[PDB]
Amino acid sequence: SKPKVGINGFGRIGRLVLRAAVEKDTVDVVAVNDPFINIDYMVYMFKYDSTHGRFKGSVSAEGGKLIVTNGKTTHHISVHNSKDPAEIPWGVDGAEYVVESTGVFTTTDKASAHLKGGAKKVIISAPSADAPMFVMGVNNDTYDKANNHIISNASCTTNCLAPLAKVIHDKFGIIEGLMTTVHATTATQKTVDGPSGKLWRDGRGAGQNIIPASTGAAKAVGKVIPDLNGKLTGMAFRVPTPDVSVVDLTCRLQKGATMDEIKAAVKEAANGPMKGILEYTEDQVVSTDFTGDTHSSIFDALACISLNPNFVKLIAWYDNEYGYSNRVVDLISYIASR
Amino acid sequence: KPKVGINGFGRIGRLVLRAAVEKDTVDVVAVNDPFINIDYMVYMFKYDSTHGRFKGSVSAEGGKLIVTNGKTTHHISVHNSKEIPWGVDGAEYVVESTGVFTKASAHLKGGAKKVIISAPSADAPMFVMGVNNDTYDKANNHIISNASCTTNCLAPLAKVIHDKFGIIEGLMTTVHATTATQKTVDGPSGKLWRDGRGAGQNIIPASTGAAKAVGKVDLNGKLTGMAFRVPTPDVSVVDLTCRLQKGATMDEIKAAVKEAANGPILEYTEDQVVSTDFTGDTHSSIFDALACISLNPNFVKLIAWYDNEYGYSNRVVDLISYIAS
Amino acid sequence: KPKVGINGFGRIGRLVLRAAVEKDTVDVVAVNDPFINIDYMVYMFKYDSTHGRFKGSVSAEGGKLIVTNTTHHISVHNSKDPAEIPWGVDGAEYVVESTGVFTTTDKASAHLKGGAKKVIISAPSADAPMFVMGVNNDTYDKANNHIISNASCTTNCLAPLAKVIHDKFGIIEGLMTTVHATTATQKTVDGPSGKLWRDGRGAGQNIIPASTGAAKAVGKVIPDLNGKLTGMAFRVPTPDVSVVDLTCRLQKGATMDEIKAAVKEAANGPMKGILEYTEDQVVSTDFTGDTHSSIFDALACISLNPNFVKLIAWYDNEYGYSNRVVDLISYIASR
Amino acid sequence: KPKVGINGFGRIGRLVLRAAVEKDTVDVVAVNDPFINIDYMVYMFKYDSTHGRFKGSVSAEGGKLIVTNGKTTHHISVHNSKDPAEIPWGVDGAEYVVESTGVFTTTDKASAHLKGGAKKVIISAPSADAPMFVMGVNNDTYDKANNHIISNASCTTNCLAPLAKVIHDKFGIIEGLMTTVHATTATQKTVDGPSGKLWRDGRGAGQNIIPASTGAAKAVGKVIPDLNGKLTGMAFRVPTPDVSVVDLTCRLQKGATMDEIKAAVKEAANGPMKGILEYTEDQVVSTDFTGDTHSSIFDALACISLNPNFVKLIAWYDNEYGYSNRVVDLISYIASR
Ligand SMILES: NC(=O)c1ccc[n+]([C@@H]2O[C@H](COP(=O)([O-])OP(=O)(O)OC[C@H]3O[C@@H](n4cnc5c(N)ncnc54)[C@H](O)[C@@H]3O)[C@@H](O)[C@H]2O)c1
Ligand SMILES: NC(=O)c1ccc[n+]([C@@H]2O[C@H](COP(=O)([O-])OP(=O)(O)OC[C@H]3O[C@@H](n4cnc5c(N)ncnc54)[C@H](O)[C@@H]3O)[C@@H](O)[C@H]2O)c1
Ligand SMILES: NC(=O)c1ccc[n+]([C@@H]2O[C@H](COP(=O)([O-])OP(=O)(O)OC[C@H]3O[C@@H](n4cnc5c(N)ncnc54)[C@H](O)[C@@H]3O)[C@@H](O)[C@H]2O)c1
Ligand SMILES: NC(=O)c1ccc[n+]([C@@H]2O[C@H](COP(=O)([O-])OP(=O)(O)OC[C@H]3O[C@@H](n4cnc5c(N)ncnc54)[C@H](O)[C@@H]3O)[C@@H](O)[C@H]2O)c1
């Protein structure tokens, strides 16, 4: 009936992918693996969520399986605690599609370990150095079932930028653009100044600081939108909020446009071919207004500004946790239909 | 030393007094704030959540505010008018830092000679040190404005890059700390609906005229911008996206700023800095070399830090100091 | 259903409306706030940083707020002076006084001049009588009590717990601390709060000691505990949800299991919906939007000995209280 | 001057070095941390989000850490061993080692430092079996001949015990219950994440008030034996980066007004407990004690009394910097014995 899914890494993305799966009812999660969270702890972490509130439904442990229900449907989920993804028995569980959301198996070689356990497809919940990247509504139809078995759903930021960039580029042509994302705190950061050896700024106390950071998210848009390769790059500022982020894209347009024309192009995409991916708003919103929003990108029409018809700053919101999680589920549904 | 009066003993008012004491280039002789009594004034100056305890002694004696750091001692007269007798106090320069007299000439009737508005003014002339302060003309400028914190950050950076490479056009974002105009939880801000939303919970899009204001200090009409208010108590950052006339390497950009930083407001760093590293920094603008990014030699994104409290408050003192000369 | 008016469309005012719409046990027909026009009211009611988007539709039509989940049609006014609000004309029988600035009986009595009959002040009052649902609400007297108080969020949390513990074991004496979320009276950065200096210091940076009469007030709503309770507060940087920390001496010694049972029995019985019991490993955000007055945190409690214990109780200081305001109106309307 | 080595260059490790440089009563000669190489150590010491830029100069030269305040210079050998048994404290000359990793708190684990040539080890935390000391309270019970592995207890215990001593000596504490409202630390998480033994501690720190267990009040009974079994308590972790506060609710033997209690604390603060216990009557908040070197600052006005025999006493502490100064003081003390 529905594609059967395994989740490796029951973290912010892993747990919220499960939440999104239950609400959307387009896939069936049959297994979860996390060596740092036993079944009773899984129940607790799924039940209570500081950002997204109490799970709207019931969750419990029965027979060494996670039982998750929202009244309508019930998911019986096998639970494993293996550190080596090769040891996860996905095949026995019937997990055809595996969400690789631990944050430490992001290459094709490491992610392929899931195939040894009997999985057919793996979706890395992060950018990959070598696995092909996909963004729903932008290049997912370029997916090639016979040759793409290990794929990436890119990053939260790329999923915000790419649908907007695609709309603007299609309509006006982006010669070049520069992106800033003001990004909420994530699990890789620290509560007080601590060790972050590869990235020193990322170790500084998240709650105290505005933190400059490099991201390949804008550059990666050139990978899901080939015509913009080399035409986009960017960076981030990490700020002390628990969730929801915003993209700030400064771009030069080939064909001149008024803000009214820009709004119209976005609304058309939002109301049509990009429904559920790209949304449009004219309200006086702030970040918390998008906690739990399922879209990849919410264009903030009122926050946008133009210097002249060929030079503009475009603003788009995203729930980096829940928006992205909804796209992982959607990406699985798409490739399973292939 | 020029004698200064302060109206509104808030974040800028109090920190202006602090910078004044450290720099010892002015003599504060009076303060007015009708919502703050002299005993309350002692406390607010003494303890500061952001900048720590005042380094020195402060107390009330003889109905006057007594402020000392060992080196100097300032005796400050206190008033509570919402009518301020500035002339009697000898207060030649009045900083209008209530934020609500952006109206300002009322201070001259009390005996003031020059007035510094601690904010942009709709009708008063604007000046920022290091950019247009030498354009001041003593005979005609008696009611003036020292612009905003953000403007003092962008323009010095803008000047160096433009002088060296030429900026055709640019768009600015400032990631900005929480201020007193904001709310602790969702509350009324009738003119600016987003600014009423809980500051500690939110990233808040906000408008700023700072880039436009740079057009007053050849770049008029070539820059505009906006802001995001974020949940930090102080220190903000400028994110300047620009098109260059003459192509440049990042090494070339870093070199122009470093050379300027070591010479003629703006500093250069190549360290792995974050916002708290600039709490108490007195510069108007601090260029973040490693955080800058270029797409190509003619399209770059430039990052500059500023303590929006302490930089500007220091400038309030300096604009006073320059004009007295 | 009782017809209700709301004065002051702030955190409590707006959430009393949310609680009213969800409960459908009262009908809100009018609102007054001179700093928030009808269009702004829609925005403030629609979007909420703490409690999320309104679950329903809200709009302005004909100078009226249209709020539906059932449909409530609400007349809107904008007077600073409560004497000018036509509660009688709009048909507002009970007025929620949630402005924070008319906490005296004389000041609050202005709503009676506009044609309202019964008034519930959303705060402690210096001279108006205070009530806490599940504790002393039956002492309400329709003939003589027309201007009343629903006490404080903190009092609504402590008093029900205090009642259970005192009834069951006897409280000789107790001292309360509430670790309290930031509220609208505080400041984003160090600013003027002339009457209360610590409250002026930047909320996001600080733990702020503050006085509260909430604990003493339990002695007004439970007379036998008068002079036996007091306390204080620490304001901390969270946007909502607070916790009570009650250290008390018991007359009759008790184990914690026995203490737990006394609370659970009450929670499963006469105090259902008022006092709740939990044994989970909860933290503050887990009570965001919780409608209870008090949630006893069984696992966070500690005892030194059977007669000296520390009891922990959570409360959504915004939404728990807002629901009690509604329940109280429904209650006195049942009178 | 006593020569000191530091294991674990974390919040305590680093601020102990800062406090050492400022007090200049010890000489730091070695540091070990396998997750922080020498160049990174420079950065982490130089810049501090909480306590500001290091007041002095810091650099890397010759695989050694060079730390100076103009007057004095500390030349620090740098190591990166995971096993503390492999650290050459003797070769570097580290007689006293601050054990500030958080993962070697038992005596057996702490004893690993002895094999490297260290003589004394100070565990920067409570210990299950190593003896605990609080400066100004029970450090004179230290026994040089037999105590080689010791504990400086916890930050919270260093706040409570000096106040507990003063109130108890003067009025007699029959029994007491403590709450500490505590700043966030490094064991917590930025967003909801795994904390398998302590589920509440895994919940996002910036969003939550978090109940937590602490043995700090009970531990006062070990450094003040007469209060054994007479104190216990718990904690709430709140979203601030530093500075915490003790909330002590106690029953008194001899009835007292708050003014008498204040007077008793004032006397101790200006006399035998100077530099350890401080008294203030100001309208303070937590940030006013950022960087404060005292173990405990009594907040006289925040105190409240129910009756002459039942009171609630409020005391502040910089859990990072107060405790760090005491570590140095304890080294300075035992070295003088
Ligand atoms: N959080 C976001 O906003 C966000 C958005 C989009 C993408 N992502 C990406 O998704 C991935 C997950 O990020 P997150 O925020 O959910 O992180 P997280 O730290 O919340 O989740 C990581 C989880 O993986 C588990 N894990 C660790 N090692 C494991 C192993 N060997 N086997 C199985 N499980 C293991 C951990 O116990 C933890 O529960 C990251 O790569 C991140 O870059 C994150
Ligand atoms: N905070 C910053 O980063 C910053 C930087 C540059 C400029 N500014 C501007 O400077 C101005 C001051 O801002 P602030 O941060 O000190 O705000 P603030 O709230 O800290 O200061 C306001 C003070 O003015 C006093 N006041 C109120 N009404 C008054 C009256 N009728 N007469 C005299 N005094 C009165 C208040 O008692 C209060 O102490 C604002 O216009 C602000 O936009 C702020
Ligand atoms: N927020 C809480 O957690 C909480 C809990 C329990 C009780 N209370 C009490 O309830 C009251 C409401 O607090 P709040 O947090 O909603 O404050 P708030 O700032 O959210 O609400 C204030 C509102 O009252 C309005 N107002 C101001 N003057 C007015 C006038 N003259 N007439 C009508 N309306 C006016 C303002 O426009 C504002 O919208 C407070 O007194 C508070 O002490 C608050
Ligand atoms: N932070 C406070 O407020 C505070 C106060 C008093 C005591 N303490 C105690 O101090 C100790 C350290 O706490 P912290 O807050 O500095 O934590 P932290 O995480 O800031 O410091 C721990 C440091 O130890 C290092 N480390 C980890 N494993 C190691 C190993 N095998 N060998 C050597 N070094 C290793 C880490 O790289 C890290 O830098 C803990 O026991 C804590 O209980 C903390």
Residue C305 contacts B, CB cutoff 8 Å: no
Is some CB atom of chain D closer than 8 A to the CB atom of A325? no
Q: Is the minimum CB–CB distance between C289 and chain A shorter than 8 Å?
A: yes
Q: Per DSSP, what are the bridge partners of residue C76?
A: C31
Would the CB atoms of B186 and C44 count as touching at under 8 Å?
A: yes
Tell whether B27 lies on the interface with D, counting CB pairs under 8 A: no
Q: Solved how?
A: X-ray
A35 lines ligand 1 (CB under 6 A): yes
d(CA C155, CA C147): 19
Contact A242, A51 (CB under 8 A): yes
Same domain for B241 and B174: yes
Q: Residue B17: which H helix or E strand, with range?
A: helix B11-23
Helices B310-324 and B11-23: crossing angle in degrees, nearest 10, is 60
The two three-digit tokens of residue A42, written as one number? 């899984």
Place of tokens 């960017």: A234
Q: Does B49 contact D285 at a Cβ distance shorter than 8 Å? A: yes
* A192 closest CB neighbour out of D11, D191, D203: D11
Q: Residue C120 belongs to a domain with what CATH number?
A: 3.40.50.720
State if residue B160 touches ligand 2 by the CB under 6 angstroms criterion: no
Same domain for B98 and B240? no
User: Annotated catalytic sites of A, by residue?
Assistant: 156
Residues D143 and D167 in one domain: no
Interface contact flag, B179 C194, Cβ < 8 Å: no
Please say whether the beta carbons of B78 and B41 come within 8 A. Answer: yes
Q: Which domain holds residue A103?
A: 1-153+321-338
B236 contacts in chain A (CB < 8 Å): 210
The CA distances from residue D151 to D111, D237, D277, in Å, are 12, 23, 20
Q: Say whether residue C187 is in contact with chain D using an 8 A CB cutoff.
A: no
- Edge-first strand listing for the sheet containing C64-68: C57-61, C64-68, C71-77, C27-32, C3-7, C94-97, C118-121, C147-149
Q: Are strands C71-77 and C64-68 parallel, antiparallel or unpaired?
A: antiparallel
**Cβ pairs B/D, distance under 8 A:** 31
CB C155 within 8 A of CB C246: no
Burial of A167 (0-12, 13-18, 19+ CB in 10 A): buried
Terminal Cα-to-Cα distance of chain D (whole angstroms):
13
| CB-based burial label for C57 (10 Å; 0-12, 13-18, 19+) | exposed
Query: Is residue A190 domain-shared with residue A239, that is, in the same domain?
Result: yes
- C53 at the B interface (CB within 8 A)? no
The answer on A136 and A29 residing in a single domain is: yes
Record: contact B185-C189, CB cut-off 8 A: no
Across the interface, do B169 and A307 touch by the CB < 8 Å criterion?
yes
Radius of gyration from C-alpha coordinates of chain A: 20
Resolution in A: 2.1
Q: Is C294 a pocket residue for ligand 3 (Cβ < 6 Å)?
A: no
Chains with 3 or more CB pairs under 8 A to chain D: A, B, C
Instruction: Find the closest chain C residue to D202 by CA distance.
Output: C283
If we measure between CA atoms, which residue out of B75, B59, B7, B61 comes closest to residue B36? Answer: B7
What the block records as the tokens of D256 is 């007292």
Residue of A nearest to C237 (CA): A207
**Minimal-distance CA residue of chain A relative to D239:** A207
Atom of ligand 4 nearest to the CA of D12: 16
Please indicate whether residue A97, judged by its CB atom, sits closer than 6 Å to ligand 1.
Answer: no
Residue D323: C-alpha distances to residues A139, D96, D134, D295, D326 (Å): 56, 17, 10, 7, 5
Q: Does D207 sit within 8 Å of A242, measured CB to CB?
A: yes
C308-315 vs C294-297, strand pairing mode: antiparallel
Q: Tell me which chains share at least 3 CB pairs under 8 Å with chain B.
A: A, C, D
Q: Are residues B137 and B193 in the same domain?
A: no
Report residue A313: phi and psi, to 5°: -120, 115
- What does the alpha-carbon distance between residue D201 and residue D205 come to, in Å, rounded to a whole number? 8
User: Does the beta carbon of B42 lie under 8 angstroms from any beta carbon of chain C?
Assistant: no
- The CA A163 to ligand 1 mean position distance, Å, reads 24
Residue from A50, A183, A192 to probe the interface with D (highest D Cβ count within 10 Å): A192
Give D60 to chain C, closest Cα distance, Å: 34
What's chain A look like in SS3? CCCEEEEECCCHHHHHHHHHHHHHCCCEEEEEECCCCCHHHHHHHHHCCCCCCCCCCEEEEECCEEEEECCCCEEEEEEECCCCHHHCCHHHHCCCEEEECCCCCCCHHHHCHHHHCCCCEEEECCCCCCCCECCCCCCHHHCCCCCCCEEECCCHHHHHHHHHHHHHHHHHCEEEEEEEEEEECCCCCCCCCCCCCCCHHHHCCCCCCCEEEECCHHHHHHHHCHHHCCCEEEEEEEECCCCCEEEEEEEEECCCCCHHHHHHHHHHHHHCCCCCCEEEECCCCCHHHHCCCCCCEEEEHHHCEEEECCEEEEEEEECCCHHHHHHHHHHHHHHHCC
Helix (H, G, I), strand (E, B) or coil at C227: coil
Rounded to whole angstroms, the Cα distance separating D77 from D63 reads 7
Binary contact (D49, B271; C-beta < 8 A): no
Query: Which atom of ligand 3 lies closest to the CA of C184?
Result: 19
Residues of D annotated as part of the active site:
155
Contact A288 C49 (CB under 8 A): yes
Q: End-to-end distance of chain A based on CA atoms, in angstroms? A: 15
Q: Are residues B139 and B159 in the same domain?
A: no
Q: Are residues B154 and B295 in the same domain?
A: yes
Contact of B76 with B30, CB cutoff 8 Å: yes
* CB-ligand 4 contact for D216 (6 Å cutoff): no
**Is the beta carbon of C152 within 6 A of some atom in ligand 3?**
yes
Strands annotated E in chain C: 3-7, 27-32, 57-61, 64-68, 71-77, 94-97, 118-121, 147-149, 171-181, 208-211, 229-236, 242-250, 275-278, 294-297, 302-305, 308-315
Q: Do D285 and C241 touch (CB under 8 A)?
A: no
| Cβ-based contacts of D312 with chain C (< 8 Å) | 175, 177, 231-232, 247
Nearest CA to ligand 4 atom 40: D102
Chain A nearest CA to B232, separation (Å): 7
Q: Within chain C, where are the H helices? A: 11-23, 38-46, 87-90, 105-108, 110-113, 153-169, 214-221, 256-267, 319-333
CA distances from D88 to D38, D77, D80, D147, D208 (A): 17, 10, 11, 21, 43
Which ligand 4 atom minimizes the distance to the CA of D14? 16
Atom of ligand 1 nearest to the CA of A84: 31
Q: How far is the CA of C121 from the centre of ligand 3 (A)?
A: 11
Q: Please check whether residues D40 and D171 belong to one and the same domain.
A: no
Residue C124 Cβ < 6 Å to ligand 3: no
* CA A322 – ligand 2 centroid, Å: 39
A6-43 burial, b if ≥16 CB within 10 A, otherwise e? Answer: bbbbbbbbbbbbbbbbbbeebbbbbbbbbeebebebbb
Closest-approach residue (CA) in chain C for A292? C52
CB C236 within 8 A of CB D208: no
Q: Could you say which DSSP state residue C133 is in?
A: T
* Residue with CA closest to ligand 4 atom 2: D320
C287 membership: H or E segment, kind and range: none
N-to-C CA span, chain C:
13
CA D337 to centroid of chain Cα atoms: 21
- Look at chain D and report how many structural domains it folds into: 2
Q: Is D103 on the interface with C (CB under 8 A)?
A: no
Mapping DSSP onto H, E and C, the string for chain D reads: CCEEEEECCCHHHHHHHHHHHHHCCCEEEEEECCCCCHHHHHHHHHCCCCCCCCCCEEEEECCEEEEECCCCEEEEEEECCCCHHHCCHHHHCCCEEEECCCCCCCHHHHHHHHHHCCCEEEECCCCCCCCECCCCCCHHHCCCCCCCEEECCCHHHHHHHHHHHHHHHHHCEEEEEEEEEEECCCCCCCCCCCCCCCHHHHCCCCCCCEEEECCHHHHHHHHCHHHCCCEEEEEEEECCCCCEEEEEEEEECCCCCHHHHHHHHHHHHHCCCCCCEEEECCCCCHHHHCCCCCCEEEECCCCEEEECCEEEEEEEECCCHHHHHHHHHHHHHHHCC
Q: Are residues A121 and A173 in the same domain?
A: no
The answer to whether residues D146 and D211 belong to one domain is no
Q: Given an 8 Å threshold on Cβ–Cβ distance, is C190 in contact with B43? A: no
Rg (CA), chain B: 20
Q: Which of D200, D165, D211, D205 is nearest to D189 (CA)?
A: D205
- Taking 3-state DSSP, the helix, strand and coil percentages for chain B, each rounded to the nearest 5, stand at 30, 30, 45
Q: Hey, are the CB atoms on B52 and D283 less than 8 Å from each other?
A: no
If we measure between CA atoms, which residue out of B273, B276, B307 comes closest to residue B291? B273
Looking at the structure, do residues A1 and A145 belong to the same domain, yes or no?
A: yes
Which atom in ligand 1 lies closest to the alpha carbon of residue A184? 3
Of all atoms in ligand 2, which is nearest to the CA of residue B100?
Answer: 41
Residue B210's CATH number: 3.30.360.10
**Partner D contacted by C285 (CB < 8 A):** yes
User: CB of C165 closer than 6 A to ligand 3?
Assistant: no
Q: Provide, as residue numbers in chain B, all residues whose Cβ is less than 8 Å from the Cβ of C36.
A: 188, 190
Counting ligands in written order, the one closest to the CA of D102 is 4
Question: Which of A48, A190, A197 is nearest residue D190 as measured by Cβ atoms?
Answer: A190
Cα–ligand 2 centroid distance for B71 (angstroms): 29
B304 in contact with chain A, both atoms CB, cutoff 8 A: no
Is residue B200 within 8 Å of C203, Cβ to Cβ? yes
Specify the amino acid at residue A137. Answer: G
